[PDB]
Amino acid sequence: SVVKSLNSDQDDVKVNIKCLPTIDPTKLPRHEPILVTVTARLNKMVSDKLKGYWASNDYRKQKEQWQNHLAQLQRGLHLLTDKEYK
Amino acid sequence: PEYFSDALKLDAQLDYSIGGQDLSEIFEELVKRACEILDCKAILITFDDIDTQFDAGWDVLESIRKFFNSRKLVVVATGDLRLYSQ
Amino acid sequence: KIIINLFAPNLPGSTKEDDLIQKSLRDQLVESIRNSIAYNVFFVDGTRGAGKTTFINSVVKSLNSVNIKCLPTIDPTKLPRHEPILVTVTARLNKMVSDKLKGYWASNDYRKQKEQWQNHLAQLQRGLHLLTDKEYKPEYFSDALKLDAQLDYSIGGQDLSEIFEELVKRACEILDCKAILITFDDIDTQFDAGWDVLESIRKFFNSRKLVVVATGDLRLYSQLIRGKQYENYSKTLLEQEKESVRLAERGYMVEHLEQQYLLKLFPVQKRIQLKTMLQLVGEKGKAGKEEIKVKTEPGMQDIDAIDVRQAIGDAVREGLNLREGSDADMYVNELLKQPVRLLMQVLQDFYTKKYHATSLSVPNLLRNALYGSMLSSIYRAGLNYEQHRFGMDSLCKDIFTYVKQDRDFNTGFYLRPQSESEALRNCSIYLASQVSENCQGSLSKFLQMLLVGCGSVSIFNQFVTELDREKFEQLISEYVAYMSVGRIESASHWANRCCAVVANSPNDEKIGVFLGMVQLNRKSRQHMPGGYKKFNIDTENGLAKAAMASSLSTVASNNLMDFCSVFNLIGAIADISACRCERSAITNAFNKVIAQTTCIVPPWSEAQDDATEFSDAITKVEQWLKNVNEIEIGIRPSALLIGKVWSRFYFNLNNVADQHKTRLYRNAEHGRMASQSNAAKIMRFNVLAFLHAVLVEESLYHSVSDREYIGEGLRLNPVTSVDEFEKKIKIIGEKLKADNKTWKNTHPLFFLLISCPILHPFIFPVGGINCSVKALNKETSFNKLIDEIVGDKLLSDEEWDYLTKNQQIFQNTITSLNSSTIVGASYDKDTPAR
Amino acid sequence: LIRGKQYENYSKTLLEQEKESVRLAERGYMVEHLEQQYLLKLFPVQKRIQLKTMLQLVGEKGKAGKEEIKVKTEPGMQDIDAIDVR
Amino acid sequence: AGLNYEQHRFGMDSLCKDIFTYVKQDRDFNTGFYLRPQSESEALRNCSIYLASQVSENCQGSLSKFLQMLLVGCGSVSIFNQFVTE
Amino acid sequence: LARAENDREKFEQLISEYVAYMSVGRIESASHWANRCCAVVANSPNDEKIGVFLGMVQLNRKSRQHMPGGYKKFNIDTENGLAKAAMASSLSTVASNNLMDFCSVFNLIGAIADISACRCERSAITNAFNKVIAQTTCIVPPWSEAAVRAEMKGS
RNA sequence: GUCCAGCGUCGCUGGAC
Ligand SMILES: Nc1ncnc2c1ncn2[C@@H]1O[C@H](COP(=O)(O)OP(=O)(O)OP(=O)(O)O)[C@@H](O)[C@H]1O
Q: Do C320 and C639 form a contact (C-beta atoms < 8 A)?
């Protein structure tokens, strides 16, 4: 109920809340870090909104920068689940 | 981490609202397609008893909880509660 | 000057220079650090939530304003489970050097220092495999013997302890600082992570250019280091030698090794201790060396900030309905000893919910704060936890569990915080708040705890506990299931079952009088000495019959015993004064249990117009109820009050059942001598002991009042006579006359009880009156004073004169109760003459 | 979960040597103190919300509840002649 | 709660056990035949209401059906309490 | 009351109660200390059941019936000025089941301690001396067999 | 000095005259 009252705002005030889809730890596939699931669901909202732009110059600038941060995270994701240092 | 990039993938198939793999939704649309080919409202999955084992039941119980959730499936289990409760 | 507002995030990364608590300590340590470098490990310790992260963040910010450069603060908890500390420190040191290296201006210096620094950094990378290794691979022996002529390596081998020594020297030259400061954090979340930090400190960080500050608590490091010394013993030896003489000697070598290892790492003359809030603000009387004030509502300008101790008290005196005094100072002094993470946690919830509520039932705000804050302690105590079941049923069962785990029954039901276990010092203050809320602004609920909540504790401790820790728990599982502490129906039904338990224990010389009750004969005995006869219910006419037919009991033993209990009288008051609506309900409470319920023996038992009969009586209750419904709002009970009145009502009632047991002479009927005693005299004191108990404590511990009107004197108990009871009433009445204070407002609980129509017939029964020249002076004075307090004449002068000096029907006095005989008593003996 | 994970954070050998029933006294005490502080840090008390059943809103006799709930039983009555929830 | 959860096949004889099998679980034989929900468990406070509904339906509009349930179902909880103690 | 080797947790717990009741380590006045030690001495009356003790003798607060000699109640006011100054300091009261009076040399030692101070002045001595000659009551220790009845009656 | 009262199990304490 509070999700539908925050993702369906009338754009009344500048401060805004964007709600990710509900995450269920039980139904989530095991041996998968929560941080990975959150980023995957966060990607869909940003990627779909990136597709929704109208200014071609703005879309190309953000896509280059946003895709750069994801490539930085995956390099460090090895450090999250390891059994030894190297 | 080699499969992290695969989860963060945009698809033209149904434009999956939930990111990542999420095998629950992948199997869900498979049943919808099978109903169109078979021309039926729903498909029933019927399981037999586990009355001689205590490991066949656990995989049956877990699969029903996670995957077989759509309205196109009706499941008819079989057994006695004493084994399942234990 | 410290002002702590309650409307901020208050996180360690959200505090300003003014919100800091340990300002004096911070300035001492920072000065102390610079002394050591100019002319080597520090330590700041304290309990959990004492302000560890906040304090260490204050130090690092202050140093950035001899030059000492400080690395960003690190903690072992928020790190990879396998990453060595040396890698983490080096990586942060690289970032600081690189930024300063880009800030140079001379091309020659920057183009030369960078390779000199990079050469050292690349050398440490080669020897890193020596730390994360599993087994010595001998192919590195060849590469460990190529001793370079440069870098001036005094000792051969890899000697990684010296590679860091050279590295830090080069980094200090680039940054142009005399020393480098490293800050760690607490290992409270991750206990195991502290071992790697400790071992690295003693091995690598031994340079003169480094200073280290560590935060935690020595109570946890000791239990970690000592846990690591046992692995140094062979497993086979630990399992073979098991005799206690060797285990004791071995159990001391570990302890001594632990102290020496810790003492060589953190020097004692370097440690700093974080004082909790109690030591800063000081005591109530002895003003401390520093003061702390807080904000309460938004918009409060800094001038009118109240003291923290006063702020806690205003949430305790009003929250628990407890008068200001020594007891109030005890609760606040206990709350200060709590960790700062929890002290500031209750305040941010009570006051915030207070502002929005005001934009009341203040104890409802306090309970919701303490219950959430102390929540973990309730689960350990086994107490109740559910949210939509609060009420009478839970608290009566709830109060029995806390005393059960405290191993106390005498003072247990006072809900004092004077226990010894921490898990029970958090469930006492919360319980004191739970009762203060629930029995507030009502009289039916106030009498239920006094009869059930604070009563069931003492009954078990005196009549059932004299029957093996599994049997003691077996006994408890039966007493609860019989008395029905939970699943209770009514205070009247509780008294009937309580009558069976109290009557099970034997009495000396088989005399049928017990604690707060009298047993009357059911059959008739031939050749009765005197005018005694069988008790009959068809004697009293009106209110005398109503106020006495509601104080009976009936058990279902081999033969039925017909009891008569003052406890059953108390249940009728709380049952009647419950529903304000209708009028037929008053009739039901008089005859709801009398001839409908059978109470079987405990399982551990070793052995005229009918309408006008009560129409005058029923009305009297109705006009009395309107007085209750208009004044009961102003009463403010408390945990102390409902417990203290029960102590006086118990010991006083104990003496009555004992002293009046040897005075059953054959001249008891119509007896009015002091040494004489009968059923009427005994019960005249039981219901008067209850009234006396409420009067004494109300002037002592009650919120609505401001001080005590008893005055200096000795508080006694009317066990055999009533000489001093009105002496109290007369003395108190004088005080309110001088102070121009009305009687009803100052003592609301006493007023609604002394005016109760039900107790009026039992104040002056027939046999209870004493005839003597001195006794009549006190008895007459007693009658006069009660006339003024109630405002209605109890008994008329024409009727009164008959009772005192040797027919006539009565409507406000029991007539033939003294003539009734106690079963199990023989009246062969007569009254001694003296 | 938190209390259990605190016990798994001890040296196993120490838990077998020091069990003289007086050393164990501060073993249980120290775990609860660590566990209690852990819960407050994660979920502050002033950020907890509890659902309210309809009884604590309105229904108790003699008290004017802060809210009023109106229920209409017969089909198609007006929003003014409906009967109270109690 | 182990009562008779049958949708149909109802009668007075099946009701007698329901009264008796409920008081035994509540372990209160003095006031078991009142069916007033005063228990401390939520699983039983929701079954007394169902039982109190069946006694009204079965005994409404008859005399033999009234004496039989009182004599048999209601009395057995009291007589048995005279021989449990021994 | 409880030996050491019988219980090493009951013995230590007694020390925790003893320091709080006896106010050692947080003292405020030497005289108050001497008033407290009077009560703890009487907690174990000798088998002979006499009012004489280690350093104190218990006077009788209420006159008895038959005195074989010329004996009477104490009657504090009978003495003279200087005598009353010393005697009033000696006098002490302990709140028990029934009030009892005590006179111990410890109070005299405590009396000298409070008087002995620097910066002597006429007003300072007058107020301090008047504080020395005062009547104070001390509750029995919490470990006494009658630590609850003396709480009901009050001072 | 005397009467009344209360705590302990005779002793003990309060009040009045
Ligand atoms: N000086 C202070 N002024 C105001 N609030 C303070 C102060 N010190 C501590 N607090 C309060 O106490 C808590 C801070 O505790 P802190 O995080 O420092 O303790 P810790 O448990 O040792 O640290 P860590 O979070 O690293 O485990 C917060 O709730 C904060 O509001």
A: yes
